[PDB]
Every structure is written in C-alpha cells, then in structure tokens.
Design a protein around this nucleic acid. Structure first.
Ligand code: FES
Lengths: 168, 53, 77, 193, 119, 295, 54, 86
RNA sequence: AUAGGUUUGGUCCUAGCCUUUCUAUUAGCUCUUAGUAAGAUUACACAUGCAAGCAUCCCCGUUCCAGUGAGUUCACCCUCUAAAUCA
C-alpha cells in the first residue's frame, strides 16, 4: 500500500481539487497554528489537508508554518502592494477556513473561466502541423484533398518522373 | 557561477578596430577604376554593364 | 553557401554580367503600376499600425480597463 | 473451391452447414495461434493464402472459403465487433490475418455507413450558440461604385497608353536593347481554341 | 534565437511530400530557415486542387492585421496571394505577365491558324 | 397584435413539451460505447428523490427541441468581375478567414473564379470550409451515403428513425435543403407506417408535430394519443391546430360554441378529420373502457 | 477606394454597430507623400569599405 | 493462488447483503446512463432515514501501483498487450 | 506483465539470472519489382570540381542558409535597455 496516514493527500486528483487560487497580489502566506488545544483543531486539520491543496494551485506563493508561537491559531497573507491580512481562524473548521480565504483572496469563477478561454485560443483547429501542437499535420489528412504519395501512389501524370518524360 | 574572461578576444577586438582607423583606405584608393578593364583595381570588381558607357 | 574566405572559382573569374534587354513599353507601364501599388500598401500598413498602437493603449489605460481595475480595487477594500 | 454463397454470403451463415460446425459461437471461437512463448506476437501473420497456397493453420476466415467478408454479410461482421462496446476486435484478438482484418475493417465501416450495421450515434450540440441573421454576411452588401459601373476596381488595372515623349525617352536610355513596341492588350485573352 | 539583422516576414513554409507540396502561412524572421522556427502560423495554402477543383487558402486575417501593424514584411508569392484574395491590390508584375502571355498568344494564333489551313 | 404563432413562441413550446413526455429511461438509455466500471452510493429515500429530481431536470436540457428554421436563400453575390483575370487561372481559389473569435455565421468565405469574378461562396460551399478548418465531431465534409433514398429505406425498415435525425442534425445545418429533405421524408415514413411512438420523449417530437400541423395531417397522431389514454394531450393538439388555422370553419365554430373535451374532438373528427370513422370508432372503443370504470 | 474584401467588411462593422450612413469608406492617400524613388538618401547612414579588400 | 482465489471470492459481499447490512438503497451510477439512479438492491427490512456521514477525506489505504497507473506513471512495455480472446 | 523456465532427494519462502513483447544497428543466408520516408563509424587526413552575388559605380549581401556534436547547468522566465523592422 501507499505509505503514510491518509495517503490520498499524495495523489494528483486530491491536489487538483483545491478551489483556492490566490489573486496575483498574494505573495506570502504564513500559518501560525497550535499543535494542542481543542480550540485549534480546525487550524491543524487545515495544515494537514489543505496546505498541500493551496500550494499546488499557487506554486509561487511562499507558504510558511509556525507551531506554538502564539496562543491562538491565525493566518496572515502578505500582498504585493504591502498590505498584510490577518485571518484569525480559531474555533473554525478546516473547510470553513478553506472557503473564507477563497472569498477574500480567491479568484472568482469569472476570472478562471476567462483564463480557460485563453487556452482554447492557443490551439487553433485549422493550424496544420505536428500533432504535439495541432490536430492534423498535413492538408492531405483532410477529406477530399490530394492524398499523400505514401498510402496511395498518385497517377503517373502527377508524378514528376513521367510528366518530365512528357516534357522531354 | 563566474565565467573565465576571454581576454585575448578583447585584445584583438580593440587592436583590430584601432588598426582599421590607422589604415583607412582613401576615397582615391577605394573609388579608383581602371578604364581598360572597367574594374576597380582595389577590389577587382567589374562595374555593372549598364554603367560602362 | 560560400563564406567570404572562400575564393572565386577560376572558371567564373572571367564571368561578366549581361544586361537584360528592356522593352520600353512594358518598362514604363510596370514602373507606373509599382508606384501606385507600393503607395497603397504603405497607406494600409500605417493604418494597421494605428490599430495596433490603439489596442495597446486601450488595453493598458483605456476607460474599460481602468473601470475594471477600480471595480476590483473597490471590491478588494 | 468456389462457393455457392458467393452472391448470397448471408445464406451460408443461415444454412445448416454453419449451424453444425459453429452453432451459436463465433467462427473464431476455436482458433488458437501457434507461437513461441506465452505472449503472442503483437502482429498476426500477413496473409494465410500466398499465391493460392494455404498456410499451415489458416485464420478463421481463410480456412472456410464459404465465409465471404462482404458489407452485405452483416451476421459475419457482427461476430467481429464487440456487442457491448461497439469496437472492432484487433487481429490478435480473433486471429484473422492482417489481410482479412483490413478487408473486414472496410466491410464493418461500409455496412455501418450504408445503415446495415447498428452503431451508437451520439447526440451532438448545435454548432452556433447564436442564430442571428443580422450580420452583413447574410444581409445585403452595398455594391461598390466601380462594381456598379462595371469598371476595373482600381484605375491603374486598365492599360494606359504612355505618352509619346515618355515612350521615346526610354528608347534613348536602352539603345540597342529594345523589344518590339506593344500596342493595347486584348481585353479578353485571345486564347486560341 | 537572436539574428544579426532582420525583420518579421510573412512567408510560406513548404511542407508536404515529394511531388506533393503544401504551404503554411507563417510569421517568421527574415533570417530563420524556410521550414525552421516561426513566430505564428497565419494560415495555409494547398497549391493543388482538391476534389472540388479549388485552391484552399485559409488566412487568419485578424492576426495578419496585427503582424503587419508591427512591421511584418511580405514575400513576393505571399503578396500575390493576398491580391488574388482581395485583401491587397493585385500585384503589378502579375498583370504584366498576363499581357506578355496574351502577346505571346497573339503570335500563336497567327501560326496555329496556318497549321489548320495546311492540314 | 395577433400574428401567426411561430414554433419558438413560449405559449407554443410549453404545449409541445407537455406532449413530448419525459421517459427518463428512454432519454438515458444505456449506450453501446466504451464502458467503465459503475459507481455506487448509499442514498436515503429523501436523497434518492433528490437524485431523481436532478435527473429529471438534466433530461429536460437533453430534450430541448431544435429551432425549426426556414430554408436558407442561396447566396449569389459577386464582388469583382475583373476581365484581366479571365483565362489566366484554371482553378477556383476559396479563401477562408480562419479566426477563432468569428462566429461561423458571420464569417467571410470568398472565391476567385478562373473567369475572374470574385464571388461569395454558396451556403453548401461555406459549410464545407467551416468543417475543413474548424472540424466538428460528427460532421463530415462529404455527404454520407446513408442519406440516399435506398439507404434511408433500410434505416426506416429497422425502426431507426430517431437515429437518422441525429445523423442529419449533426451532418447538415437546420436550414439546409438536405436537412429539410431528410427531416420531412422521415416524418412521412412514420405517418405511412404509423410509428408515432418511436419519436416520443425525444427532442424531435415538437418538430414532428410542427410538420404535421402545417399539413393538416394530425389524424394518425391524434388517434395514437387517444389509443394510449392521452386525452389531455389530444385536446392540446387540437387546440394548437385551431390557433394555427384561425380562419377555419372548425376553428371558429369551436370558439363560438366553446367546445371542450369529447365535444371538441367529435366536431373536428366528423367535419375535417379524414378518418372520422376511425376516430369515432377510436372514441367508441374508448367508450367501452370508460363504461367499465363507471360500472 | 478600399480593396474589395476590406470594403465589404468595414460596411458590416458600421451596419453591425448600428451606423446606417452609407458614406463610401475611403483612405487619405494625400497624407502619404509619395517621394520619388531617386530622391537623395542620407549618406550619414551609409557604410564604408573596410581597409581589407576582403 | 488457488486457495486464495477461492477464499477471496467466497467473502465477496453482494449488493443485497450490503443493502441489508447498511439498511440503505444501493444505487448504481453508470457513465453510459448519465445520472440515471439505478437501484440494484434495497433493504427488504426496515429502511433507514439518517444519511450516512460523508467523510470529506476518505481514510482508505490506496495501492501505489493503482495510483501510479492512474497518474500515467507506470510505463510497462508488457501491460495492455494485444492477446487472444479469453 | 495475465506471466513463464531455472536452486532441492523433495517441499515451501526469499532471491538473481534468463524466456516471452516492441524497436534500432551490424553480420549470415536469401533479395521479382512499384510509390514514400530515411541514409558516412570517425571534430582524423583530402583529389582539388562546384556551393555569394546582385546592382548605372556607392551601398547592400557574402555574419543568413547549409553543416557538425568536439566541448558543455551562458538555451528558458523576470527586470532594465540596445541593434533591427514599423517611410
Ligand atoms: S503527409 Fe501530406 S503530403 Fe505527405
């Protein structure tokens, strides 16, 4: 079996299920949680489960974690403009925290839809070339064109050996 | 991290540029022409046929 | 292709060029055609440049772009 | 070695001969490839019949001449397609040589194209989100002035006879390198019929 | 790559097989290989007629405007294609060639009529 | 004010939707395609109904009816007619403005003919190019041979009319000539063979009614509904016929007499319906079933 | 006048927006000063031969 | 291999045995049938009313090879080879 | 991997080596003949043919292309800002 407790956290499917994609302003996120204390139960579940999901969708934001430095679990975000955003997360479940930060610092569905549209425009269905980038490579792969001399040898007329035998 | 300085390259670079100024060919040398062969003896090039006359 | 250090073939040393004969009728008509043609093109090209420069300006500091920025900034605060 | 079912290939599979040799199992149920090892070669033999000579262990199709792989012989074709996923088996699956599998593939597609063989036809969405007919492509485009007047779109398309002084000027320049003077070109190409 | 002099040029990239050409309208550099690196593909050109007898010239006209607006040049055969399309005026030399052909064909009827007269 | 009601009229569509029906099994019929292992959930009764409710709504989106369009008028419009290009070329030159943003309807496809006339491409030619350069799944450049009469008869003999409509809808445009031809021809084979049930609970039911109502051939369909104990639906069909032919003896007569229920059916059955005997006889065998329930 | 295709497109743009004006769209070639092809160029931008003939 | 094959198959819990153990409907979701909720087995006894708690993160021990292939990391030149019909 | 053969007198468990599958190069033996795709082992020497000119003189090109893989985290991003092209 896979090692570790809750091995699902180490699967791409779990890592791609994160719904918190920070705005371009967010640069550094610090998590100051406690390891013991019933009040901070939600805080540590967030670090156990979701920090992997956050860092995945946000590969450039520096996530930093500190244990037992303060009596209360709290997050803090450092934006590029210089504003810092203390999110107190005491007595709050990990899923609530997950949606709180999505609300205040997550991209809306409109922004994500727009980004997805950009990818659609990159692959133009008409552009011919290597299938690593395009759909078809030649125009002989389109129905009702001139086929490639490989599969079906073209009439001797079209071949440059017998039309040159007519030239000469 | 650090790159070995290509020193001789820089030396010859300067040397060449300077020496060209000192040995600049004059207009009388560049733009001379032999009216017999119709070729500039400096570069041994034949002027265009439509310029011969 | 040859570099500048490669010499000229002794065979082609003596090669003089030959002037292509000119039909004075075609020459003048084509010369006038080119004139107008290449001018219409220069006109079109400048027109597209204004479009490109306008698209950059409107996207960077256009009214629609500035409103979206304020909308997000107001929403952020 | 000729078959009475050549013209009616559907009749062999209905006859009692078929039903005695095969019954309800496909014609390839009892074919085992002869091969070195435990993993079979990923390509089956090219053809079982070479210059009208049959190989040792002929594939299902090539061991019964009365089995004609035709787009009309729908029953036979069905045997070589999944009844659950609608896929043509690979040649190693049934053992039919490369020759027959390609012919079979064509047959499958032909029957499917002709509507003889059932296959899943999905429900597709419309091509255009909007069906508006307000764009100029469907509306009427104002005809251009030159188009209305049947004139060359640009005035310099038409031949303009050069002035005599200008024509003579070039004769001075290219002395001894002149071609025959050309008059106005024919409006319509004088292509000899 | 950084070339020592050149400009963005809109050209035709030759694909296809032997005796089976197929061109690709591409925005490349004035010094890159014909079939080498290009900035953007702006369409295609099938120089051989299809089953319906036409030449298939796709043109990403929207983007062609942007590249020309940035200084993109055009090769001779590319200019002539936009002419036949109607995006640009007809190429001057294109016309002059038709005239030369028609003047050659003028001579031809003089000679061919004689052949039919004799036999 | 009062205008000829078009199909897309919300008043009209609502009626046609009720007549269509929502056979969940038929809409979500198991398909013959690459299968994958199923999945299982433990659902409370309340949850099972919520799974049904969201399944109901999903089917509605599936059965959304194609908008019926009038056959497009052939595009015959020239742009240039240069004579210097006559005889120069030997082939056409189709220019397609491939562009991701352009809607296919609002696209520029022009052709340079050998004659030198710069035309606009035919509706047919256009679609060919849209496909060549923006290939859609399920659409083919060359017309599939299945649409030939010889092949369509085989599809009809196998009771595969619903399939033919899916092929036609995917290959051809709703306003194409080829579309309408197959669209209508199918409705005929159904009418001649009385297979009105085959298309029920599909997105093509509305288009089937729309065709028949405009030809005054609702007899067979109306009979079927009655034979299946669908009186409420049958009345709605008769009503629709009245709205689309207001200037009729039966239409005005029913309005003046406010005929409803059995009376509404009988008046049309005897007056206009060409199978009055059969319709009356249908409403007479119905009478036997009605008498038993009353007893 | 505009070339064939461009003219057909500009119109539809006007029409699509809502502009009904049928004013024939044209250019401003007057602004384009068509300088003669033999006009003296700037010698400052011209190069010079190197000391080496090659 | 034999004594284990027959043992694993002998402990194969059925859909109705499951419905009875959990007292809830066993609903089959087929991708070929959209969201059609096909009930394969129902508890013949009393049905229950409390939705089984849906744990967001399932504490199931996964197998590395399964996940390896799922993520397109297993590239055996021997897996999924064309073989005769069995 | 759907696996198989091989330790022993024998049986289990470990374990390596092989087998079966798919490519590429070279050899042996064969090798009727049509299209297409590819084609020095060698950064070791070369016969000495041919591949950079065009243009009414300047200028421009010959620095690109075509080669090779000997050396090798200077190939991609960001920040500034050249040289080009946009008359
Ligand atoms: S692949 Fe199309 S010409 Fe060969």
């Amino acid at each position: 079996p896979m090692k570790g407790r809750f091995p699902i956290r180490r699967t791409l499917q779990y890592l791609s299920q994160g719904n918190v994609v920070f705005k371009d302003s967010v640069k550094v996120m610090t998590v100051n949680y406690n390891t013991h204390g019933e009040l901070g139960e939600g805080a540590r579940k967030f670090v156990f489960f979701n920090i992997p999901q956050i860092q995945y969708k946000n590969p450039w934001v520096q996530i930093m974690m500190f244990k037992n430095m303060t009596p209360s679990p709290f997050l803090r975000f450092y934006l590029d403009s210089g504003e810092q955003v203390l999110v107190d997360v005491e007595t709050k479940s990990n899923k609530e925290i997950m949606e709180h930060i999505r609300k205040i610092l997550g991209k809306n569905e409109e922004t994500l839809r727009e980004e997805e549209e950009e990818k659609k425009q990159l692959s133009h269905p008409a552009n011919f070339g290597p299938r690593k980038y395009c759909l078809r490579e030649c125009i002989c792969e389109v129905e009702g064109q001139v086929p490639c001399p490989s599969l079906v040898p073209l009439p001797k007329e079209m071949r440059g050996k017998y039309k040159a035998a007519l030239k000469a | 991290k650090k790159v070995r300085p290509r020193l001789i390259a820089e030396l010859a670079r300067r040397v060449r540029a300077l020496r060209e100024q000192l040995n600049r060919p004059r207009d009388s040398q560049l733009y001379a022409v032999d009216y017999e062969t119709l070729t500039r003896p400096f570069s041994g090039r034949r002027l265009p046929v439509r310029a011969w006359a | 292709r040859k570099t500048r250090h490669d010499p000229l073939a002794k065979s082609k040393i003596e090669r003089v060029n030959m002037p292509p004969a000119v039909d004075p009728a075609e020459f003048f008509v084509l010369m006038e055609r080119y004139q107008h043609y290449r001018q219409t093109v220069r006109a079109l090209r400048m027109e597209f440049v204004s479009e490109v420069q306008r698209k950059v300006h409107e996207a960077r500091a256009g009214v629609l772009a500035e409103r979206k920025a304020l909308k997000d900034a107001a929403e952020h605060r | 070695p000729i078959s009475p079912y050549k013209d009616e290939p559907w009749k062999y599979l209905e006859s009692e001969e078929y039903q005695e040799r095969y019954g309800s199992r496909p014609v390839w149920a009892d074919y085992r490839r002869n091969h070195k090892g435990g993993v079979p070669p990923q390509r089956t033999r090219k053809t079982c019949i070479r210059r009208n000579k049959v190989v040792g262990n002929p594939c299902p199709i090539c061991r019964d001449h009365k089995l004609h792989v035709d787009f009309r012989n729908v029953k036979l074709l069905e045997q070589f397609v999944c009844a659950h996923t609608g896929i043509i088996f690979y040649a190693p699956y049934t053992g039919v040589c490369v020759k027959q599998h390609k012919r079979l593939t064509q047959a499958i597609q032909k029957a499917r194209d002709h509507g003889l063989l059932i296959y899943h036809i999905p429900q597709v969405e419309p091509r255009d989100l909007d069906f508006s007919t307000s764009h100029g492509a469907v509306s009427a485009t104002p005809p251009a002035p030159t188009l209305v007047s049947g004139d060359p779109w640009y005035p310099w398309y038409n031949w303009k006879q050069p002035p005599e002084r200008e024509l003579s000027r070039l004769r001075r320049l290219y002395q001894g390198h002149l071609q025959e003077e050309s008059g106005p070109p024919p409006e319509s190409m004088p292509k000899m019929p | 790559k950084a070339y020592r002099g050149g400009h963005l040029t809109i050209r035709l990239a030759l694909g296809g097989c032997t005796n089976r050409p197929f061109y690709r309208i591409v925005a490349a550099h004035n010094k890159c290989p014909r079939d080498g690196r290009f900035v953007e593909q702006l369409g295609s050109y099938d120089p051989l007629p299809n089953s319906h007898g036409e030449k298939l010239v796709a043109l990403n006209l929207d983007r062609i405007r942007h590249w020309i607006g940035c200084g993109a040049h055009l090769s001779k055969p590319m200019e002539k294609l936009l002419g036949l399309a109607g995006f640009f005026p007809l190429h001057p030399m294109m016309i002059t060639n038709a005239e030369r052909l028609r003047r050659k064909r003028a001579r031809e009827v003089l000679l061919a009529s004689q052949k039919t007269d004799a036999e | 004010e009062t205008k000829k009601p078009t199909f897309m009229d919300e008043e009209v569509q609502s009626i046609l939707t009720k007549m269509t029906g929502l056979n969940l099994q038929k809409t979500f019929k198991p398909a013959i395609q690459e299968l994958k292992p199923p999945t299982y959930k433990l659902m409370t009764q309340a949850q099972l109904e919520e799974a049904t409710r969201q399944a109901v709504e999903a089917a509605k989106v599936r059965l959304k009816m194609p908008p019926v369009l009038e056959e497009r008028v052939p595009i015959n419009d020239v742009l240039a007619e240069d004579k210097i290009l006559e005889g120069t070329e030997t082939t056409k030159y189709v220019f397609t403005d491939i562009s991701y943003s352009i809607p296919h309807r609002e696209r520029f496809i022009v052709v340079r003919e050998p004659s030198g006339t710069l035309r606009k491409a035919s509706w047919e030619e256009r679609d060919r190019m849209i496909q060549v350069y923006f290939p859609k799944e399920g659409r083919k450049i060359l017309t599939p041979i299945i649409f030939k009469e010889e092949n369509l008869r085989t599809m009809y003999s196998q009771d595969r009319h619903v399939d033919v409509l899916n092929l036609c809808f995917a290959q051809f445009e709703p306003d194409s000539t080829e579309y309408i031809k197959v669209h209508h021809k199918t409705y005929e084979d159904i009418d001649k063979r009385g297979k009105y049930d085959l298309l029920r609970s599909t997105r093509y039911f509305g288009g089937m009614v729309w065709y028949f109502v405009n030809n005054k051939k609702i007899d067979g369909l109306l009979i079927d509904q009655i034979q299946r104990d669908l009186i409420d639906d049958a009345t709605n069909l008769v009503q629709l016929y009245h709205v689309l032919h207001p200037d009729g003896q039966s239409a005005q007569g029913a309005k003046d007499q406010a005929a409803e229920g059995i009376n509404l059916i009988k008046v049309f059955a005897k007056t206009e319906a060409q199978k009055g005997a059969y319709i009356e006889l249908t409403l007479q065998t119905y009478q036997e079933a009605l008498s038993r329930h009353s007893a | 006048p505009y070339p064939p295709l461009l003219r057909a497109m500009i119109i539809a743009e006007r029409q699509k927006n809502g502009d009904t004006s049928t004013e024939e769209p044209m250019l401003n070639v007057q602004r384009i000063r068509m300088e003669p092809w033999d006009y003296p160029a700037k010698q400052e931008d011209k190069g010079r031969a190197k000391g080496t003939p090659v | 291999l034999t004594q284990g094959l027959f043992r694993g198959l002998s402990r194969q819990e059925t859909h109705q045995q499951l419905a009875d153990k959990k007292g809830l409907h066993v609903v089959e979701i087929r991708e070929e049938c959209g969201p059609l909720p096909i009930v394969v087995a129902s508890p013949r006894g009393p049905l229950r009313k409390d939705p089984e708690p849906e744990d967001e993160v399932p504490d199931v021990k996964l197998d590395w090879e399964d996940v390896k292939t799922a993520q397109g990391m297993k590239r055996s030149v021997w897996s999924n080879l064309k073989r005769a019909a069995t």
